[PDB]
Each structure stands twice: as C-alpha cells, then as structure tokens.
C-alpha cells in the first residue's frame, strides 16, 4: 500500500491548517473586524457547526456523482479558494469594513464546505487503496491516520502562537500571515496529494446511490401500509417487501446501512459527554499547584497533554496491547473494543469526580498544643538575620532571611509555656536589636522587617484563621504610607487601611488574577499588580512607596497543606485518552469495514455526523450550567455509563456485514 504515502501527509498538512486557522479565528473576529462579542461567538459556533454538518454534502457527492479522488481534488480546490478569500480578507489596506467582511465570511463558508467533505472522503479513499484479502493492514492504516490527525493538532498548538504576535502585515497587527501560513501549507498539501494520481486504485462509483437509497427507503415506507386490505405487508424484515423492485443486490446494502445507522444512535450523547472536558477540567486545574519544581506549568497549557498522549499510546496500543490480547481466545470484534473504550471514558470521569472531592478538602495546617505558626517577611534594603529565642537566649528559631522577596513557607515554633514573651534577635547592618512581642499559643503570627532608617524594627501580626468559602480566597493588607488608603478589590465595600504600618481587616474576594485594583489615598490614585490569587489561601500584602522603585506590593501567603499538584490529573488524562484512542480508531475501521462496496464513504459521513450532533448537544447543554463541579462529574459519569449500557445492548444484537 505504498500509495497511502500521499494520503497521510495530506491529512497531516490539512488538519494542521484547519486547527491553525481555528485558534486565531476568535482573536481575528474580536480584534480585527472589531465585532460584538455575542455576534463573534455566534458566527464562530455557526462556522464550526457548518464544518461538522457538511460531510454529507461531501460523501453524497462522492458516492453518487463524480466518484472520489475526483471529489477530493475538486473539493480541496474549493477549500484552497476559501483559504485564498480568507487570507485576502485580512489585508488591512484595500477596502474597509465591507470588503474585509465579505471576503472573510465567504472564506469561512468555502473553508467549511471544503473540510466537511474532504474529511470523510479522504479516509474512505485511503481505505480503498487496500485489498479485501489484506483486510488486516487497513486497521494499521486507520491507526496511522488518527496519529497523523492528532500530530497535526499538536503541531498547530505549538506553532500558531508564533504567528499572530508582533508582525506588521500592513501598518497594523498582522493577521494575513496567521491565515496565509495555513492556506499555504494546505495548498502545498493539495500538490502532494495530486502526485499520487499514477499510484492510486480509483474506484468508479457504481450508481446514483444516495438517490437509489432514498428511493428504496421511500418505497419501503409504502408497502406495509395496507389500510383496508393486506395479507403480506412486508414479511420477515422491514425491507423484505421493498424488493419487488430495486434488485436485491442493493437491498442488502441498504439493510447494512440501516443497521449501522441504528447502531450509531446512542453515540452522539457520548461525543457530547467526552467533549465536556476541554474546559471543566481546566477549571479543575486552576485550583491546584503547578510549579513541579522544574517548569512552572500554566493551567491552560495542560490541554496540550491530550494529543501528546494520543501520539504516545497509538503506537503503544496497536503494537503491544492488541497483540498481547491476541495471546489467547480474547476476541475483540471491533465492537467490544468500542464498548470498553466507552467504559474507560466513564472510569475517567469518575476519577475526575474523585479528584474534585479530594481538592475540596484543603485546610491550612491547624495548630496543636505548644505550636505557633510563624512567617517572617523582610523589607530592609539589605539582608537580615532572624532569630527567635526564649528565657535566656534559648533556642526557638534561627533563620537567615534575604531582602525583598515573597514568602510562602512557615515553621512550627515549638513554644514552651502557656505564653512566652518572645525575645526577638534581629541583626542587620551590624546592629543589635531585641524586642518582645507577647504571643498566645496555637495561633498564626507574622513578622515585618522594615527599614527604620539606619536600624530596623519588628512588627508582629496575629492572623485569625477565618477560612474563605469554597472556590474563593481571603486577603488582608499592611500599609506603609503616610496617609490612609482605600483598596477596593470587592464591588461594594471600600476596604480601608491605616498609615505608618497599620493593619487592614480580612476581605474575602473571588479567586482569580487581579492585575490592577483601585487604590485611592488622600491625593493620588493608582493600581498594583496583585497577580494571581489562588483560593483557600490567605494573602497578606504590604504596600510600599520606596523612593527608588515607586509603588510596589510585596506578597505574603498562607498555604493549604494538602494542595494536590498539577499531577494526579494525568491519570484522568490517561484514562480519557485511552478511551479516545480505543474508540475513534476502532470506529473509523468499523465504519469502513462494515459498509457495502458501493457506499464506502456514507458510513464515514454517518460517523462524522455522530460527532457533529455531539457538538450540537455540547452547544445546547453548555448554557444550562448551575451545578457544582464534583456533582457535575458524577452526573457526567452516570450518564456516560447508561449510554455505554445502551450501546452495548444495541451492539450485542447487531448482525455483522458479510
């Protein structure tokens, strides 16, 4: 099957372009055409839905007229024209707001019409290259096909950010290249495909199949209807008397098509349920540690791990696990495989629910007897030497704290009595300063090292362990200015602070990233880069107005001990990607290998419409969201399980094509 060489490098290079032009599409709509947000999201979703529903207009026009490999060429040409009318509609010089809109919309329309009709037909054509005697090697071809698709997706994710940023196309931000590169690579794929015209095994279409199928099914739904008569409406099956016409060599084919269609009924719900992890799992990742000690991993980037697992399990599965199954009588009939894929998907969402139930158990470390939690913050310009001691210079704590930084650690200062007037030993700039802050046991305390001109002093702050509500954090502030401030993170209440090292009161603000907060003093208004604020974490911010560096806020955090890392989410990624690989590849092969020779691509159309109806269900359901995450995952697991049982029962009775 050497001629499949120019079938996989084409799918790679066109999925690459499609995923590249999808990611930048929303940014282009919002920031170039300057469209309203609801209009932009609406048109983007409409374009995706059109991409998903058009495969019928490709499969029918392949298996009825014009054949295929003459639909691939003559439809990828329209696809190229669509990319041209897109990249031409991003030119910022000629025309404005009417040309730029007309070309863009025509480009979306033609690109959708191309992709939805290249996607099924290319896989069907790749299948046809093989011989029925070599029925086994087709499975590896479809595995390689899916590998190429997800490799394209992966490379698009890694390389599209390097296109839409800081280029000049003509006097403004550069979106033509962000569209030109996908178009250029796709038209360079249309030339690698056409090179194989001397190599393929082009099957001529056998007849006006979709016309024949529709006419046959209509006549079928006419014979049983014997209103005031009848003795043999349609006996032993529901087509067997749609056979007085339409010779039987076709009636078997339409029977097979109907049986596979009846089998594919439950699947769209599964596609919707599996889809609802691209965003909700990211919300899960937002609420957990991610530094990893090697590379601080942003929660958004976690997504790219999904295609990577496909690239690492496809050659793992198809070359290890499937053979290891074949060691004995275990008979995967390419339907048990899809059922077990469904089962692993359900197990994956159950594991996600378990992870949720574990995350909501964060508590910051409570104190037992003779235990106070301390956390020293330094603001002296140089470096300071921190020591805490007892009655007689008796060891309680030694620690060298550096200059301006943040801090998240602490230390379990083993106190000694009901209350110990702590002797602090701070040494800085070769100075000896010792003050006493009487403290109560089993609490949390913080120090501020501040520049008292030549010398320094220690300020003690006692935290009251007011925990914040679920999925939300609490903050308090320390002021170092000469005037009282007002830092209103929240909507209604203007939080206030005090001058000359004052203390604020705890405020409970929504978790997230706060880049700038209103801060009005007696005279001046400004803002500060508070940055990220994880939930279940008590933050303390010190506001400084140092002469050299201006207004900057020095972080100081509490911490939940049992904060699970960004790991422990790979297991649910592993179990969902195993489901995806065991399901998609097997579905492609099953659709191709259980289809009559005259309609080899309408089954691919049925599979793609399954995915499309799944997307439509995703769209309709996603708006009706009012449930907690853990309950959401347990419901998505129970529903997926019942769908799996429905599919298993409806597959145990599916007679195979022969």
């Amino acid at each position: 099957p050497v001629s499949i060489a120019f079938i996989v490098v084409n799918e790679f290079c066109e999925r690459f372009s499609y995923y590249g032009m999808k990611a930048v599409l929303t940014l282009y709509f919002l920031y170039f055409l300057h469209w309203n947000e609801d209009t932009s999201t609406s048109v983007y979703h409409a374009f995706s839905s059109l991409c998903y529903f058009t495969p019928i207009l490709g499969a029918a026009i392949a298996d009825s007229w014009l054949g295929k490999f003459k639909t691939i060429i003559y439809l990828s040409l329209v696809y190229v024209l669509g990319h041209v009318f897109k990249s031409l509609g991003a030119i910022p010089i000629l025309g404005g707001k009417m040309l730029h809109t007309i070309l863009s919309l025509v480009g979306l329309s033609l690109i959708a019409l191309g992709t939805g009709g290249i996607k099924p037909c290319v896989a069907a054509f790749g299948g046809d290259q093989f011989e029925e005697e070599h029925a086994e090697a087709r499975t590896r071809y479809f595995s390689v096909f899916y590998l190429a698709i997800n490799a394209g997706s992966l490379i698009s994710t890694f390389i599209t950010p390097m296109l839409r940023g800081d280029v000049k196309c003509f006097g403004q931000d550069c979106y033509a290249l962000a569209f030109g590169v996908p178009g250029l690579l796709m038209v360079l794929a249309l030339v690698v495909f056409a090179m194989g015209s001397k190599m393929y095994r082009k099957p001529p279409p056998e007849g006006n199949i979709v016309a024949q199928v529709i006419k046959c099914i209509w006549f079928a739904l006419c014979n049983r209807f014997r209103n005031r008569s009848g003795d043999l409406p349609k006996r032993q099956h529901w087509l067997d008397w749609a056979a007085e016409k339409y010779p039987k060599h076709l009636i078997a084919d339409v029977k097979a098509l109907t049986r596979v269609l009846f089998l594919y009924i439950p699947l769209p719900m599964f596609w919707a349920l599996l889809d609802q992890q691209g965003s909700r799992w990211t919300l899960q990742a937002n609420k957990m540690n991610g530094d990893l000690g090697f590379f601080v991993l942003q929660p958004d980037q976690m997504q790219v791990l999904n295609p990577f697992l496909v690239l690492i399990f496809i050659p793992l599965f198809d070359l290890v696990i499937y053979r290891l199954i074949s060691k004995c009588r275990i008979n995967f009939s390419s339907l048990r495989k899809m059922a077990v894929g469904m089962i692993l998907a359900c197990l994956a969402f159950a594991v996600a629910a378990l992870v949720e139930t574990k995350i909501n158990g964060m508590i910051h470390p409570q104190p037992a007897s003779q235990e106070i939690f301390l956390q020293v913050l330094n603001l002296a310009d140089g470096d300071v030497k921190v020591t805490v001691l007892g009655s007689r210079n008796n060891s309680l704590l030694v620690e060298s704290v550096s200059s301006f930084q943040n801090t998240t650690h602490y230390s379990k200062l083993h106190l000694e009595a009901k209350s110990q007037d702590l002797h602090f030993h701070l040494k800085y700039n070769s100075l000896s300063v010792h003050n006493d802050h009487s403290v109560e046991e089993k609490n949390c305390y913080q120090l501020l090292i501040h520049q008292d001109g030549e010398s320094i002093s220690s300020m003690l702050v006692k935290d009251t362990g007011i925990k914040p509500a679920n999925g939300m954090a609490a903050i308090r502030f320390i002021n170092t200015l000469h005037k009282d401030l007002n830092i209103s993170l929240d909507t209604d209440a203007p939080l206030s602070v005090g001058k000359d090292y004052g203390v604020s009161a705890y405020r409970t603000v929504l978790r997230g990233k706060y880049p700038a907060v209103h801060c009005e003093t007696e005279d001046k208004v400004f803002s500060l880069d508070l940055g990220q604020l994880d939930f279940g974490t008590t933050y303390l911010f010190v506001i400084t107005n140092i002469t050299s560096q201006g207004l900057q806020a020095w972080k100081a955090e509490d911490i939940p001990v049992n904060k699970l890392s960004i790991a422990w989410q790979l297991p649910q990624y592993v179990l969902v990607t195993a489901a995806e690989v065991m399901f998609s590849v097997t579905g492609l092969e099953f659709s191709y290998s259980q289809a009559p020779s005259s309609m080899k691509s309408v089954l691919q159309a049925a599979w793609l419409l399954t995915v499309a109806v799944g997307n439509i269900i995703v769209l309709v359901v996603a708006q009706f969201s009012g449930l907690a995450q853990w309950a959401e995952f347990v419901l998505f697991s129970c529903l997926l399980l019942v769908v799996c049982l429905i599919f298993s029962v409806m597959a145990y009775y599916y007679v195979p094509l022969k």
Partner: nanobody, 123 residues
C-alpha cells in the same frame, strides 16, 4: 439606559478611575464602551468592554495604560488610565449598546446607541 459619569482634574503624570452606572435597566444586557472628545472637532474611541467583561479592547493610543472593567451587580463600569499626560484633556463620554447581532465595528461612533453625558477630565 440613562447612564452617568464621575472623574476629575489630574497632575501631569497621575492617573484616574472613571465610573459609569446604569440607572434604569439591567446593566447585564448592555455592551459598553468609552469615548473621548477633545475640545476640537474629533470623537475618538477610547476603550471597549464586552458583555460579561470577558472581552476588552483598547484604542491604539490607550494613553499610557488603560483598564476597563464592569460588575454586572450594581451595574457600573470602571476606566483606569495610568499615565495621563497634558494631552487627552477631553470630555470622556460613556456609551452603551444593547446586545444585538450586528457587524458594525465595536470601536466606532456608530455601534453605540445611548451615550450619556461626559466628565471634563483635564491634566
């Protein structure tokens, strides 16, 4: 609808926060934008925040730094300039537009329908 406005004089290098409340209808259903008008013959788009505040866009100038935000509760929108200079002494207008399906640009004096009075921020 019936929008309002609050803000004032500045030092040559200070900053401000502009406030705009909705006085007669649910502020959630309103796309929102900021305009200026120098004491000349212009009407410059300044910044724009979309419904739910999820998408924000700033003009090419966006003097120093600007940040728009909105809380659909209490129905108010916040503009925060950073580096006001002796330019942009203008009459900053606050503009609103209902959530329709239109292809009109979000950064023009055409999409917004009901801009109210404006402050007289000087520098």
């Amino acid at each position: 609808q019936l929008v309002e406005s609050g803000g004032g004089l500045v030092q040559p290098g200070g900053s401000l926060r502009l406030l705009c409340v909705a006085s007669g209808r649910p502020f959630n259903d309103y796309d929102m934008g900021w305009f200026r008008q120098a004491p000349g013959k212009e009407r410059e788009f300044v910044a724009s925040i979309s419904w739910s505040g999820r998408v924000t866009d700033y003009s090419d100038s966006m003097k120093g730094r600007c940040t728009v935000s909105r809380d659909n509760a209490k129905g108010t929108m916040f503009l925060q300039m950073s580096n006001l200079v002796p330019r942009d002494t203008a009459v900053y207008y606050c503009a609103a537009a209902r959530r329709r399906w239109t292809f009109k640009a979000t950064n023009t004096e055409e999409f917004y329908e009901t801009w109210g009075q404006g402050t007289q921020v000087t520098v």
